[PDB]
Design a protein around this ligand. Sequence first.
Ligand SMILES: Cn1cc(-c2ccc(=O)n(C)c2)c(COc2ccc(-c3cccc4c3ncn4C)cc2)n1
Ligand SMILES: [Mg+2]
Ligand SMILES: [Zn+2]
Length: 312
Amino acid sequence: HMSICTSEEWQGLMQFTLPVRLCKEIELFHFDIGPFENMWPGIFVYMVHRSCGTSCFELEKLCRFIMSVKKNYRRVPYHNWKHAVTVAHCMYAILQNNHTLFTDLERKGLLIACLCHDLDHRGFSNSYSTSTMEQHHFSQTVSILQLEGHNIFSTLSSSEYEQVLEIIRKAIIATDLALYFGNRKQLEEMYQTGSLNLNNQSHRDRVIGLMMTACDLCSVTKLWPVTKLTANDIYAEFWAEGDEMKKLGIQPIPMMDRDKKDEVPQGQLGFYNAVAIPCYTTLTQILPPTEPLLKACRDNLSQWEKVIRGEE
Ligand SMILES: Cn1cc(-c2ccc(=O)n(C)c2)c(COc2ccc(-c3cccc4c3ncn4C)cc2)n1
Ligand SMILES: [Mg+2]
Ligand SMILES: [Zn+2]
């Protein structure tokens, strides 16, 4: 277990250059990687390069690492390689727009953590100690790092190496949405009381934790026709899970039931109000430059309202 890339795959990636007409596009929060499948591993290399230059990773081990990650994502409609890269791009925009808050270690850890955060997702929920899927996705990240010529951190001291693995573990654990409700609440209080202090490691962990939810949910921050299409992918998976439950004579909850299709826009609306809006509001409060994520979220919420009210 742990599949690996071929030499053709890592060498082809080493040779890629992003077309000039995307370089301004890719800096924008709402950028959609969607139309550029061929370029996705290339796009990740690019973002690593912009954010730490052409000498932050041995370029060969880097391309090998990315191409093996890709081969350990499965061909599922939503929790796949497309979503890893989408989440990593959101993290890239955040780090670029907040350039001096984060250490060099943090920047490398979090881009890698984002690409690996759904490693070997099967297309079924946590429901079908806790943070099950996530402890596992971290486990798989550890295994790839450990292979052959795939250790991109080899050139760190053992003190830095232990540091970056622990950035990664906490980051991927933070992508379990059950834990997001409490982290956010904690952050909301600290901000209120004025007690938030980025010199404090456990405060940094929390902020980073929120940053991982915001990236993980970022398909709600793209332009309306892209968010709409992604929502179809999320449903392809949820309904396939609901179909497997009916196969056993089990009644799935409404969200996994394709017979409950007309209650889609209502469902979307509640999620936006209950999860997405508070997430990007607390983020915007701590990191003002992330404000365009909130704005794009608000715009998509009002699209969903108009669907419900019957006008699009
Ligand atoms: C980008 N993105 C990730 C996610 C996401 C991430 C983590 C997570 O745990 N969930 C559930 C979703 C989303 C929102 O997706 C949604 C899916 C279904 C609903 C829904 C709720 C209730 C009844 C419903 C619903 N749909 C049909 N009916 C009848 C809402 C939102 N967008
Ligand atoms: Mg996940
Ligand atoms: Zn995810």
